[model samples]
Target: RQWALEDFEIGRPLGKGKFGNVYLAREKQSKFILALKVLFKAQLEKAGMEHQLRREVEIQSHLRHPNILRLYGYFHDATRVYLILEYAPLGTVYRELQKLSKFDEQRTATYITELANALSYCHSKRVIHRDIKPENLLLGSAGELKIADFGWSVHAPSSRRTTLCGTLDYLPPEMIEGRMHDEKVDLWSLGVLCYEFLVGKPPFEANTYQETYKRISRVEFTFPDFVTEGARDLISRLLKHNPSQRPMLREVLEHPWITANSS
Candidate 1:
């Protein structure tokens, strides 16, 4: 059942969202803080998101990774479904990136590596995290990376996927061309994330979504002046127009900039 805002402790506040609210709740017995995601089934149905809600629960419950947010438990009542999740007080990596003028290369590299490992693990399990943007990535109190938001994730039996689901700027060329794509899509998004990390903005941005799509279709986004040669090379490789030409997780982990263990 969804807990009322007034029922929560005075110091604790729920994070508000469009579909539902995430309450910073404490287990009545354990007193440990838990992020409770409450979603009304009827509301989801009304919004034509029943499938998305099911997918979120199905995908997250089966997957487990240190760099992926953990879903501890779930329950449902007549009114809504309650998802008990681990709390990450630090919030989304996107907000953090926007607040800072620049993140240290080492910090960025660490997060990138962690995310790569997580994605590699996910791909190995035949799951494709179609949406890998910064907004879906979170930071734990200990500075560890965690992938959140399974709304766009899907289980892929083959290496190719048709439905396009991700941020516009991070869409791979195949997706732009309406061709089948796969886990490489996530790699491409990671490349965009890396570019943003170095330059503080998406590489293929334009005045409008149409312009942005045009630039993405051309696959000719330019690297900023401040980006180093190594960073640029890696980003280019990851964002290659040909999905088959993109580096695998292993190769990405072994790249000079990423493998040196130095940011």
Candidate 2:
């Protein structure tokens, strides 16, 4: 089947990004709904993001999981590159989390468990998803979590890296302390993600972003009185300042809170 810009009818705007905006589209023949992310070649190359975009496509195409958003194919012209992405019916997880103020323990547990499964599969494939935050997660029609971005990932078979990458709030202490890391960084981010899922804020959240870093540096943060004991126990273990102390992705599924939520 020939896929090109003209082959699909661009519908509504899905989102706006640095290089360009995403639009909802449908293939005329197959009637398949897709998100068409149009990246301006000039802007992408100017910002030296062409490599990142290419890497996202390459990495995403090779990795497949139910919780990972699908990248079908892409095409380009003189001024733009169009990526055909699976449309998340419910949009981003951040938006959902923001709207709800805080999710119940059961829902939080469900989403984190799903993410742990996806991360386990990813690490097994030698893919390190350095960025694991609510903003990067998308919700499917069934409200399942779908990891939708790999802009900050590395596929290192050797399992060692020292790049200070990922969002500050979700960044592991190792990344903050400027040390080498492996898949464990993702585990730390998952802890932060879980906190945000149930608390409507990052674990290190403070009055300001700079203050948040201060809190992270000191490993200073408190679970509000309401956060359940089970989730608190798991979060503390995963968010330990020392990366070595953090649990493996597989171990996350074994958390009592996760087990109950899975049930």
Candidate 3:
């Protein structure tokens, strides 16, 4: 027998998503606390995203890391599917980042270090997290970083992929130019994330989508005067036009900015 709706005592609403809502719940037997993601079956099927949900579930459940959110399991009825997940009471990094406008170097470096290790583990497992942004990251009770969403993730045992996915601002040159992409796409996003952490905005932000694409296509971005040399250098290296020229996640962890500020 697997977990069913009756197996959990649902509490207050946690949040809402496109498919369904999250709720605080307690398992009847273990009395364990968890977040229940109730996704509407009809909506999922209607959106033709059934495969995406399956892949998300499969990839996230297999990942084990302090910085990665835990997906316990899933059970479905005729109307909906309920996913048991680890709860992060502090909510999304996007929310916190908005409040401060920009994060200090120490905080940004710490988050980058945690995220780098987590992504390294995922790459080792042949998983590529195509979409990596503050919105997909959560904060645990102790303020630890948790990579919460895997909707755009893919388990690619193959070396490269050609599909164009992920946010436009974070799109790597390889993907933008219609070349085969690999795990290095995450490296590019990591660099973009680092830049956003320090600058309070995406490097290629523009009033129009076309302008943004143009800027990203050209890799045309300049650092604010307040940004230090080490930080600028790190971001520059990660945002390289060629994926092969981008530093590996491990190298990012050892970069001067990360090494100096992470402690």
Candidate 4:
């Protein structure tokens, strides 16, 4: 059965977004807490993102991964579409990074490996997560990372996405050059995420989005002096000028930085 806002007993405020508000709600019968995303479909339709909104729910419903956010179910009424999804008590990875100041190599490696696994699963199904940023990554109470939000995702069979979505600082060089992209674009974003986790900010920063795009086009950025050579090597390999040269998700998992602690 679908839950109503009036029937909710709010424990803690989960988070808030531009279009919707999320809350941690408890079920009286099962005594379970679930994350409920309440969005007004009519409002989203008015905003001209009805297709995007529907896609987000449809794609996420079919995707199941250990490192991906779990969608319980969804219901649409006259005015709103309510999504019952897994609750990530720890909030976004962005908030975690803010609290940590910066991630050490071990922490970065752990999170990166999980993200790679999630992306590999998505790619295997011909799904491309066009927007992969810290804000979309969440952490459970046990600290497991889960990827959320699919507003910019596509399921094309070929590597030919042209919408140029995603955060500006995380765009690939090919994307900046007006070339079509695919799953590899997500890898590029992951590379930038790793850099941000290590350095406390994105690699290329500019006062304006245009300047940021220009920097992405140049594909030249300096790493923090304190970072290890191995970390720098992996970041460089992932940030290749040519998308073809960028390491695949599986290869990235087996890279030295990722598996160096192996017995």
Q: Is candidate 1 or candidate 4 better by TM-score?
A: 4
TM-score of 2: 0.91
Per-residue lDDT tens digits for candidate 4, residues 1-263, read 66665555667667877666787887676778888887887778775667766788888989999899988777777887778888888889999888988988888999999899999999999898877888889998888889998866778533434444335887777666666677788889999998999999998887887788878888878987898898899899888778889988988899988887322
Model 1's TM-score against the true structure:
0.88
Give candidate 2's root-mean-square deviation (CA, Å): 2.4
Candidate 2: count the clashes: 0
Candidate number achieving the greatest lDDT relative to the actual structure: 3
TM-score of 3: 0.92
- Candidate 4, residue 84: the lDDT equals 80
User: What is the full ranking by lDDT, best candidate first?
Assistant: 3, 2, 4, 1
- List model 3 lDDT by residue over 1-263, tens digit each: 37899999999997786665899999999999999989888998876678768988999988999999999999999999998999898988888889999999999999999899989999998799977888888899999999877866886533333343434787777766666678888889998999999999989888876788798889999999999999999999989888889988888998988999995
Model 4 compared with the native: what TM-score? 0.90
Task: Write down the lDDT that model 4 would get.
Answer: 0.82
RMSD of each: 3.2, 2.4, 2.2, 2.5
Off by over 4 Å in 2: 157-167, 207-209
Candidate 2 lDDT = 0.82
Q: What's the TM-score of each model vs. the native?
A: 0.88, 0.91, 0.92, 0.90
Candidate 4 residues lying further than 4 Å off, grouped into runs, are 1-7, 157-166, 176-178, 261-263
